[PDB]
Amino acid sequence: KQEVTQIPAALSVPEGENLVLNCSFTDSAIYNLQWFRQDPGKGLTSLLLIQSSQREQTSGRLNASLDKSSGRSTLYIAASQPGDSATYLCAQLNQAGTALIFGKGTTLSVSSNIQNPDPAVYQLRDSKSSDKSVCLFTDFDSQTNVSQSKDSDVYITDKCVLDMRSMDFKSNSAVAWSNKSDFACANAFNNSIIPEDTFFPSP
Amino acid sequence: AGVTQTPKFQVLKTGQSMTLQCAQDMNHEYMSWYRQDPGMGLRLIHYSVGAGITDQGEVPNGYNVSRSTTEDFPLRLLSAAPSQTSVYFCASSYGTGINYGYTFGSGTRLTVVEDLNKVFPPEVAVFEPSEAEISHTQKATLVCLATGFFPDHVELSWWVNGKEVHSGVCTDPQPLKEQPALNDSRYALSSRLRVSATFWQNPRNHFRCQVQFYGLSENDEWTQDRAKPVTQIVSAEAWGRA
Numbered sequence: 001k002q003e004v005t006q007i008p009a010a011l012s013v014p015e016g017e018n019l020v021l022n023c024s025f026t027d028s029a030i031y032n033l034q035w036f037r038q039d040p041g042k043g044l045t046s047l048l049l050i051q052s053s054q055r056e057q058t059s060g061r062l063n064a065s066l067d068k069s070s071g072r073s074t075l076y077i078a079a080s081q082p083g084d085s086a087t088y089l090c091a092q093l094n095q096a097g098t099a100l101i102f103g104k105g106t107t108l109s110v111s112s113n114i115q116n117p118d119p120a121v122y123q124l125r126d127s128k129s130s131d132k133s134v135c136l137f138t139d140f141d142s143q144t145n146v147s148q149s150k151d152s153d154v155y156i157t158d159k160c161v162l163d164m165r166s167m168d169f170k171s172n173s174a175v176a177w178s179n180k181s182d183f184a185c186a187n188a189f190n191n192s193i194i195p196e197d198t199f200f201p202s203p
Numbered sequence: 204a205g206v207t208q209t210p211k212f213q214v215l216k217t218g219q220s221m222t223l224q225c226a227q228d229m230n231h232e233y234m235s236w237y238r239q240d241p242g243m244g245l246r247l248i249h250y251s252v253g254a255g256i257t258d259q260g261e262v263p264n265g266y267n268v269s270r271s272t273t274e275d276f277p278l279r280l281l282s283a284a285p286s287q288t289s290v291y292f293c294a295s296s297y298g299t300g301i302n303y304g305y306t307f308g309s310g311t312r313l314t315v316v317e318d319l320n321k322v323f324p325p326e327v328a329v330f331e332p333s334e335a336e337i338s339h340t341q342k343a344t345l346v347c348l349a350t351g352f353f354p355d356h357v358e359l360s361w362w363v364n365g366k367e368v369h370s371g372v373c374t375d376p377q378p379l380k381e382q383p384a385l386n387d388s389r390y391a392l393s394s395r396l397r398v399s400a401t402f403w404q405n406p407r408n409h410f411r412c413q414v415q416f417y418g419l420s421e422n423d424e425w426t427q428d429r430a431k432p433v434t435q436i437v438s439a440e441a442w443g444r445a
Contacts, residue, residue, distance in 0.1 A: 034304050125333070162397055175393045
């Protein structure tokens with residue numbers, strides 16, 4: 001009966017933007033709302049708690065609004081950073097109120113701004129296994145999206161942003177490897193939407 | 204002052220019983236168990252409004268709980284089923300008032316399989332930076348590849364010389380399936396460590412990637428030819444190259 005709806009299910013925005021997380025819920029009367037953050041493979045960290053008696057609740061760059069009449073709630077993240085990327089859960093206390101009912105969550109992705117995109121694919125040297133050639137699509141800007149591609153032996157990871165603090169340098173990277181023969185390493189990414197001037201040096 | 208759940212990870216054969224522990228030292232009256240599934244959010248299983256009191260939640264079937272004391276609230280799996288492969292979260296709250304919030308534990312990743320023969324430790328290999336990347340960017344990316352492990356109960360970390368590093372590191376948030384159409388698919392996880400070319404060109408610098416794998420206990424029986432995939436650390440190393 002009681003339902004908590006979070007929209008959108010997935011949100012991707014460039015860093016530096018303000019972003020909005022929506023949460024709607026059935027019924028009214030006495031309740032509270034609690035927003036949580038969880039990173040992949042870890043627990044839930046409580047971000048904000050809004051009672052029915054309140055309309056606003058803030059904490060740092062987080063702003064939580066509550067409209068009791070319409071049944072809508074909103075989580076504002078001002079000046080989003082890549083460190084804000086996580087899964088955001090909205091939960092409403094039931095009418096008893098003895099338990100907490102959750103929404104399906106919003107997976108937020110805040111893409112880093114790449115100063116000077118230098119997209120390239122480099123093949124790396126092996127270790128414990130013959131063949132099994134691994135290589136790295138790196139230094140592309142945040143607008144680039146990597147595909148899983150089609151092959152029996154080829155695998156491609158999702159994008160991934162690292163930050164070298166000693167150099168003030170961020171860079172995206174996706175990894176591809178395989179154990180087949182017809183597959184040279186660099187041919188995994190050509191199927192995906194890749195920039196035209198990407199550097200493809202042969203090993 | 205927090206909620207502690209045990210164990211962090213668990214692998215179960217179908218039909219086995221298992222109890223998930225949850226304790227809190229915050230003198231909270233309310234406690235509840237949840238299970239998290241992909242695309243499902245958190246679903247309530249059981250909750251307790253005090254010692255000796257227990258009520259059913261949204262999905263109580265397959266589980267039972269007890270509240271003998273205020274601090275403890277164990278979750279008992281009657282007969283482990285593959286449909287119970289999930290992440291289980293324990294939460295507590297002080298009382299009835301809406302001014303009080305909920306505090307969650309770290310969770311328990313629990314995987315149920317028909318046969319323990321499906322449990323595999325990861326194979327870890329570090330791949331050294333390419334000469335082309337060093338020449339083009341004056342940076343050197345190391346790639347650590349953990350492949351073939353099941354379940355996805357792994358913790359990857361990088362160690363440069365003696366120190367565990369986080370700067371210049373990013374790991375895949377989720378491991379991928381080597382056979383994506385299978386429930387019991389073995390997984391693969393990668394991670395990158397990027398350093399300066401001059402740091403990598405020092406032959407005295409030692410790079411170590413290790414994956415902590417949570418597998419079987421030493422009490423579980425093992426009738427396979429290969430080594431019992433117990434909880435272990437698999438590592439791979441590389442030295443700098445001038």
